[PDB]
Structures are given as C-alpha cells and as structure tokens.
Nucleic acid binder design. Sequence first.
RNA 1: CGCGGUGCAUUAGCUAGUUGGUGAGGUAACGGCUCACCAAGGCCACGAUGCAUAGCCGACCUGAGAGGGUGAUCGGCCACAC
RNA 2: GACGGUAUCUAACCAGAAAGCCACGGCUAACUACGUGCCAGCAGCCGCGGUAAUACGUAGGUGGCAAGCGUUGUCCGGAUUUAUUGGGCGUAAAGCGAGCGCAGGCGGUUUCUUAAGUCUGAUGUGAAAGCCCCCGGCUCAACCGGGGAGGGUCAUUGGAAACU
RNA 3: GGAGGUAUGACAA
Lengths: 87, 200, 135, 163, 81, 131
Amino acid sequence: AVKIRLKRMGSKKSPFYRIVVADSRSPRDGRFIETVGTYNPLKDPAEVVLKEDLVLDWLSKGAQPSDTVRNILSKEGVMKKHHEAKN
Amino acid sequence: SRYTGPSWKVSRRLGISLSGTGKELARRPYKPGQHGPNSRGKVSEYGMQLTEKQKLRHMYGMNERQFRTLFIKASKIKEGKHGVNFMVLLEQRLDNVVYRLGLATTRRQARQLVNHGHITVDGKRVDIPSYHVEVGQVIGVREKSQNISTIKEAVEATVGRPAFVSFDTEKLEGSFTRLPERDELYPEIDEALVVEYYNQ
Amino acid sequence: PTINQLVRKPRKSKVEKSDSPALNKGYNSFKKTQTNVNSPQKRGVCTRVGTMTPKKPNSALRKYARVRLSNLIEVTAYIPGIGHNLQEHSVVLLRGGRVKDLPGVRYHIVRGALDTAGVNDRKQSRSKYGTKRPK
Amino acid sequence: IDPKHLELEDRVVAINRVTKVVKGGRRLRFAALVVVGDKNGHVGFGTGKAQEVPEAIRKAIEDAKKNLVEVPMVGSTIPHEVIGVFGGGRILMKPAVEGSGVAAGGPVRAVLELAGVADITSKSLGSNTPINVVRATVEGLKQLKRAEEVAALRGKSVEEIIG
Amino acid sequence: ERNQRKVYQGRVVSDKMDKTITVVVETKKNHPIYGKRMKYSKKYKAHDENNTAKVGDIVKIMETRPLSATKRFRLLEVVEE
Amino acid sequence: VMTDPIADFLTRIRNANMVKHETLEVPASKIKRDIAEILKREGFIRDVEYIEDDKQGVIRVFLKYGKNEERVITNLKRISKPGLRAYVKADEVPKVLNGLGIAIISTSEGVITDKEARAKNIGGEVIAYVW
RNA sequence: CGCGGUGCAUUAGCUAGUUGGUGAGGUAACGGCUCACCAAGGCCACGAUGCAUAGCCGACCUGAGAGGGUGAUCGGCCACAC
RNA sequence: GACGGUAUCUAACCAGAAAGCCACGGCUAACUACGUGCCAGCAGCCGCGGUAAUACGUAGGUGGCAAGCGUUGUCCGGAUUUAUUGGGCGUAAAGCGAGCGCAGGCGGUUUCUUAAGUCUGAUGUGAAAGCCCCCGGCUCAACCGGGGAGGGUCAUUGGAAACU
RNA sequence: GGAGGUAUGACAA
Ligand SMILES: [K+]
Ligand SMILES: [K+]
Ligand SMILES: [Mg+2]
Ligand SMILES: [Mg+2]
Ligand SMILES: [Mg+2]
Ligand SMILES: [Mg+2]
Ligand SMILES: [Mg+2]
Ligand SMILES: [Mg+2]
C-alpha cells in the first residue's frame, strides 16, 4: 500500500527522521516518491518540519500513514483539514 | 599526541625564543647535539620551509594532520592573505587564547588548564584545547577553579597584554577584540615558505 | 597523426606490467586456473636454500631460497639479514621487492611471520627484520 | 638597459662542476649560472666560469648586470599567457590569480621572484637544463607585452581593446 | 492535446520487400575525444501500406508499435524520386 | 588544390610580416574580405583595397608597423583546421591573451569578434586567433 | 525506440523461422511470440559473426583540466538461489 | 526502554598506570665513535663495503611522524612516457622500395534555397545520499541535519543562418 | 680558400 511514514537517519543513539511517501513494499530506506517533512524527538519536546500541500495531496490521492505519523499530522492539523475537505 | 619533551631544545634548534623569554636561547644559541656548536654547513630551501612550518606547530603543540587540515580550511577562504589567515586560525585556539590573555605562563600550562577543564566559553566547560574561538566570545576561568594559586600568580605577573584582547583580573574573563592583526603577530616567521611547502 | 588516423585507430597506450607477477595471481584447485588477485604477501615452501654470487661491482655470498608458492608458481627470493632458521620444506612468507645484485630475485622473505625466526640481536631498524624489543 | 641606479640582488641557480681534459689528467673548473634582479621588472642572468665557486659567481653576476631585461607586471602578475622556447626548454607561463603565489621549483621560481612576479602558474615541459630553461623564460617574458604599447601601435584605446 | 511520437527523415535503400522498406537517416555525431564531425548512417525499417516508396528516395517515418520483429516505424511521405 | 585558403591567407600575412614587407595581394573571397575589414577596424592593419578581375576578386593589404621596425601583428593561428572544426558556445568563447589579441568568429549574426559574441551571448565557428 | 558506455581483424563473413508478407493461433498486450503457406530476402568494414572479459549506474580515488582507474560500504535497475 | 544504572554530572585520591616507529652519503630534513674488513651485510634510484665506512652492525646524538610508524601490493599524478587539450619521423625510434587506383577523408569563386551540423530563448527532467556554498546540533572536530548551487556531446518547441 | 665526381693485455677502484 502507498503510505506516508518516516525513514531513519543520523548516527546511532542520536536518531533523526524524514517523513516520506513510500510504498509498503519498499524498504525502510529505499524507494520513495516525495519527501514532505522531517522529524526528531531529540529536543526536549518533539520537533517537526512539514509540507502541508504535498502531504494533503497524497492523503487525498489515497495515502495511509502510520500511527506516529498520524500523531504528528494531528499535532500539525493536517488530518483535520483532510477530514474537513472530505466533508 | 602531545609533546612532553624539552622546550629549550626545540627553541634552540629553530633559533628563536618561543616563550619570548630568552633563556631558551641564552648562553647556547646553537642547535642541539654534539654537532651543535661546530661549523654547521649549508642548508637547503626544503630545510628552510620545514623549519618555518615546525616553528608554528612547535609553538602551538600541534600535530601534522591538524596543521594540514587547518591549512586547507584557510585555503578555502578568499577574503585576505593565505598564511595570515592561517596564523589567525592558529590564534583562535584556546591554547593560545589563554596565553595571550595572561591567564598562564606557557602554552603547555594553558593547554593543561583547558583540558583539565578550568576554563569556560560563554559559561560552559571545555576540555578541548583545539576549540576554535570566534570574535566576540567570552573565555572564563571556572568559578570554582579561580582559587588556584598558580593562575593568580600567572595573572598578577602579567606584562602589558596584546592590543587585540580585552580582559579583567577580578572577573578573570577576556576576549578577542579584532580579527586579530598580522603585524602584531610574530614577524620572525615567513608564511610564504609554509605556502610553498604545502603547495609542494 | 591526422585526426582521421586517430579515429581509424585511436591512441593505444604503452602497456604496463608489474615488478612481481607472482604475487598478482592465484589458484583454485577446483577449476585449476590462474586467478588474478592483487596480493601484497604470500606463503610458500622453501624448495632450496643456498648462496649465490652477485654482480660485478659487488662480491659476496647472497643467501637465496627457491620457494613453492600457494599458487604453485616457483619463485626465487632473498633471505635478508644475518642468520636464518630456514631449511628445505620450511614454511616461509614472501614480500615483493627486487634485489639489485642478482637479476632472478624479484622477491624478499619476511622475518617474524612464520617458521622464519626473527633476526637475532638486531636493535636498530627492528620492525624490519622482525625481532621483539630487548627489555 | 642599464644596471646603474638599481638595487640588483642576486641568486645562484646552479654550479656545474665541469671538466676539460689534458695529457696530465683533468682540468676541473666550476661553471655557475646566476640570476639577478630588482624585484620591479628588471631581471637578468649570467654565466660565469672559474676555478673557484665565488669567482665564477662574481663573473656571472657581472655578466648578468650587462644583459638585463624588463618584464611587465599586472598586480604582481604577468599580463597574458606565453610560451617560451629556447632549444629544448619549453616553458608556459599563465597569469594567475592573486594570493595563489608562485608555482615553480627553481630556476624559474628564482627568476620570477627576483623579477617581482609574486603570483603565477608555470610549467617546464621539455628539458631540465637550468641554462636553457632560464633562457626560454626570459624569451617568454620578452614575448610579453604592455597594453599601452599595443594600444598605441593599434591606435585603438585601452578600453576599446580589452572591452 | 496528446503527445507526439518521434519522427525521422531519411532515404530509401532497398524496396525488395512487400509492405515494407528500409530507410537511412545519416546524422553526423562528433567523435567523443577527437571531436571530428563523423558520419553516422543509422537506418530503420518502415511499414509501407502500398509499396509506394522507391529506392534512393527521401522519406519521413514516425515510430509506432512493433509491426514486425525489425519494424518499428511507419511511412509518412515520398519526397524526391 | 588550396584546401584552406583562409589559412593560406593567414600564413601569407605571417610570412610578409616576418620579412617586413609592406603590402600583399590575395585571390579573395567574401570571408577574406570580412577578416580583412575586421583587422582594418581593429588596428592590426593600416589599409586594405579591392581589385575586380574576371577570374576572382583580388584583395590587397597594406600592413602596419609602429616604426620602420616594430610590428603590430606578431602571429596568427587558425583553429578550425578544417580537419577538426572548432564550434564554441557563448561561454566557451576564447579570450586571446586576456584581451590583448582577438579571436575571429563566424556566427548567425555574421563574421564578428569575441567582444561582440560574448556580449550578444552567441557563439559559432572559431576561425582565427591573433596574438 | 533514439543515443551512450570493453579488448582482439594473429577473428570477414554471418542468419535460415533467419528477413518480410497473407491467414490462423497465442499472450494482460504488440509482434515470428508460434504454425502453415508465398517470396528471398536481411546484418556488416560506421566492425556484423566469433573469442575473451565484465553486472550497469548514482557515485569513489586521482588529476590544472581533458581524462584515467574502481564499482567495497549507502541508494537505484538487473540477474541468481546445489 | 534491549541499550542501561551506559551516556552524563558531582565529589576523594595518586604524577602517579599510560611512547614508540622509521630515517640520518645525494635525490631528502637530519653526524660522530667503536667493531667488521668486497666478508658480514645495506640498497626506492645513483651505488656503499678490499684495515681510518657520516651508506654494514652496535652505541650516543639528531631529524620526520606520533598511538601510531615503516614496509610490500594495487590506482592516479608527476609521465607532453600514446600528446584532442598536448609529441614526433634527414642523422636518435620511425617515410612502406615505387607507382595505378575502388571505398572513405578533404576540397576553388559565387546567386538562390534548405537547415543535417552549428549558435540561441523558454519548458521539462537529470531521484535521494555524496562533492561544493551558506546555515545550524553533537563540550569542538570527525560526524549529523536543513537549505541552496551545480551536473546532460539530454529531450520538445521556437528563431537565425555567417561557416561546413 | 673550400666542396661534387674522377695476435693479446685478470676483476673492481
Ligand atoms: K556479474
Ligand atoms: K649505520
Ligand atoms: Mg597531469
Ligand atoms: Mg642533508
Ligand atoms: Mg638499514
Ligand atoms: Mg671503521
Ligand atoms: Mg634511424
Ligand atoms: Mg542528487
């Protein structure tokens, strides 16, 4: 399935993540179509960067995020906008 | 690696007072060894180049690869003169900052203070004598370590400091106030010879 | 040359080659072929140990060993230093390098590796010739 | 063309111990090549011979003073690229950027440091004979030109030429 | 409006075949190292609907699906006998 | 034969310049006329004149010397030999001697200098440098 | 499908479902992909065929650049699973 | 929360437990003594050694690097030593013994035409990572991350046509 | 004045 998930980067014991649009068939780090932001919890809070337009376009086109990405997009208000646009 | 060996031996090979004292040249201004005082023969341009390079890394207690990388990072600059920028980047090392501020008598003493952690930058401990320093920062002795008698002796035995620095004794904090300058550095060195050396 | 000539036949470089072809080859017992492998060192079995007379400006007894390699190429090497524990059938390790005295010796023997004993009472240039420190 | 009223300082390229042969063996002499200049444009070279190093040096200096030439400069650089040939010694010299320093390892480095060219890119293509490489060097520096001279020849203005 | 599939102009060299021909293009690439403007006589097979084209005649051909194993191109014109 | 009359023209100029002759005559063509006019109006030549004769228009040149002795031209060189022809882009336009010489180029606009080409942002065939 | 990237001519000829066509079958689909039938065409000195070698690429090392050499780690395409 | 009671921070203590490798005739920075006596041995090249060895071996001393150093093997460069950039053929290597000519390579002046080559505008793509520039976080650095730049004898369309 | 033709010798140093 087409999905919106996050891939691992940075050194060991100091992680970092890029939100990415990946099929479930591809690897954790491998094929992707588009990057729409990035993430790390290494701050005292979590810290986030996002590309609302493209991520909402993929969600419309049929994407299916993971749980933690759903949490992030909730905090950033994208899931709510997608819901509204479907209403 | 760090050099635990004699100071005067190096200084009197090179034919220069590194400490600016003189007694690393006084009474014996000739290269070490039992072929020291006798008639040295001619010497080559490669020898002169190597000697100039060794002057600097023996001042700053540095390693060849650190020296080379710092040379390359100076080469990456276009806004000035090459070897002068090299010397400035040497000056921006806590080993030399501690010395120029009069907070220690020797660069070895200074490196030991830095690494043992008696010094701060903007209020944060640093055990890294190679730590680069930008113009505007604030070096500061550790407020617990201000009680050691060695540093107080070294600070109250201070001759007039350089022009490119600011410093207070009660606060034991100082900083650079300039790039700093070239001519205010040791003019005994010919940086062009280092340039030709590492142009190879 | 004209450019037409340089297109009809291009510049074909001066072919190069090694000072140690024996090290640049291998052997698999299954297919039994020279496998081309760039190996710095090799193992061998001394098939003879002897002395040779060097070229004219020099005069000496240069100690050599003819050796049977892992790759079944038989090779003449030099026994550097002063003294050796070597005999026929003595396992030995070989490195590259000419011996400018005799022509037919493109190789050297390594000390402190295998059955080759370390040199005895060599204190300077000691890694070379392979003998542990005097404490 | 006059060494008078100039602070010419010298530098020795090489001393080639050179022999003549006689019934009584070998007559060994020293031949020296010296390059002298003022680091303003004016530079020359000289060949000396003698049974003594300093005597041949003196003779070569005194012959170099009598054979000077002036090189143009542009911010411690030459104006344009040039190829100098003199019988087996090809040297190409390019105008380099400022701060890049000299690119040579003697004798060309000596010639150009004495002439006052602080920043240049050079290369010895052919032989390595110091005499002929130095001669090809001065031949190239003679091939070189001045914008004012070329513009006064052509009639066009300086800006009208460089564009 | 939709895309446009590739087209070439060339010359005929053989018409001994039914419903088909061979066509030659004659570009000129520059030799990659030495830079000389070389010839390059690429050629193709074209589907003729009616065996119209004649040998040594200029022609245009557009690509299409494989009509045979060799064929990939479709006749369009006949220009200079 | 004359497989390269442009280079023959350039070399005839060079030869006369080396012997320090004063004038030249050449079986001309329009590209030679263009080059001669460029040299006329760029300062490497004093004067140039035409002659119309039935086989082919002759063109005669009157060379230039700063004195009786000094030369204005030093040497020329064709690059499109033509065995290897030199076409170049507006960025790859050469700069003969950092602007103390001139490269002669033919472009869509016509036969022009590196000045005009590198200004207009065009390129074309290079046919001659002039030191 | 265009174009491109390795050595040998002490390898000059190669192919016969091979080349094309009329039908039929067949595949997710085009077409000799396959069968019959008709014709003898088709490829090549711009290097076919054969022999050897090799996974290709982004990239890596070097170099003034042109270029050379490599294709380990990471990613992409391919191929394989005694 | 496997890592993990690890990172990290605090305090007590000991200079105390923590430096070697290669080279030193020239190319190449670095010199003497003793033994040995074309033997032992050294050697990247030139070459040292035959009773006074700065070249062997040891000792002292010095120099270059430094938790590494040296050596082999491989690649590049220097090597313009396969020269497109960027070489040559009288004597050094090399002009076939000489000619007739298929193919190809090249080709006089010039009008008109085209536009294959060439030049050129715009659009797209050239994934990410990496090189490079500006930023920022790891006690700095390596490293890590963000942003940008560039990269195609690349492709479509649209013009010129001086030159081939 | 100049051009074309008309028996052995050790090795190294
Ligand atoms: K493979
Ligand atoms: K020794
Ligand atoms: Mg190079
Ligand atoms: Mg020396
Ligand atoms: Mg030794
Ligand atoms: Mg002795
Ligand atoms: Mg010959
Ligand atoms: Mg990329």
